[PDB]
């Protein structure tokens, strides 16, 4: 009714390519955290060395920011969920995994999704994902 309606999940705009699961039976190496900007600010420098983020960029959506952060080794969204989830004692939290990295980041750089900071020199690309020809 009047205050920024807290988002319980990602926006239908970015829901065109996501996982939508926390206890899946597959190991993902890319995850997109969605929570207040202050939250992504602490998980940005934190994951920076906790998962060797293949690319960590803090973007803006509508009421919060999407802390993007890939990963080298493989991990289940359940394990990464235990970390980002452990960071929910100062505000809401909606960390989830991502199936199509390149895509998400793309729809994230195009309005209304703005960009703030990133560890990559030009967002993700073929040097971050795994577009091995086929």
CATH number at residue 39: 3.40.1310.20
Element containing residue 116 per DSSP (H, E)? strand 114-118
| Experimental approach taken | NMR
Number of domains in the chain: 1
Residue 132 has phi, psi (to 5 degrees) of -70, 85
Mapped onto helix, strand or coil, the DSSP state of residue 128 is coil
Q: Which residues contact 16 (CB under 8 A, 6 or more apart)?
A: 103, 107
Q: Which residues contact 19 (CB under 8 A, 6 or more apart)?
A: 28, 77, 96, 97, 98, 99
Tokens of 117: 């900071």
Quote the domain boundaries for residue 65. Answer: 1-134
Q: Which residues contact 95 (CB under 8 A, 6 or more apart)?
A: 31, 32, 33, 34, 35, 80, 81, 84, 85
């Amino acid at each position: 009714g009047s205050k920024v309606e807290d988002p319980k999940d990602f926006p239908s705009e970015l829901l065109s390519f996501l996982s939508h699961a926390v206890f899946s039976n597959r190991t993902l190496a890319c995850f997109a955290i969605y929570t207040t900007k202050e939250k992504a600010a602490l998980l940005y420098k934190k994951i920076m060395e906790k998962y060797s983020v293949t690319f960590i960029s803090r973007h803006n959506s509508y009421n919060h920011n999407i802390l993007f952060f890939l990963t080298p080794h493989r991990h289940r969204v359940s394990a990464i969920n235990n970390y980002a989830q452990k960071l929910c004692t100062f505000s809401f939290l909606i960390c989830k995994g991502v199936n199509k990295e390149y895509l998400m980041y793309s729809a994230l750089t195009r309005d209304p999704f703005s960009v703030i900071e990133e560890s990559l020199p030009g967002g993700l690309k073929e040097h971050d994902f795994n577009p091995e020809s086929s």
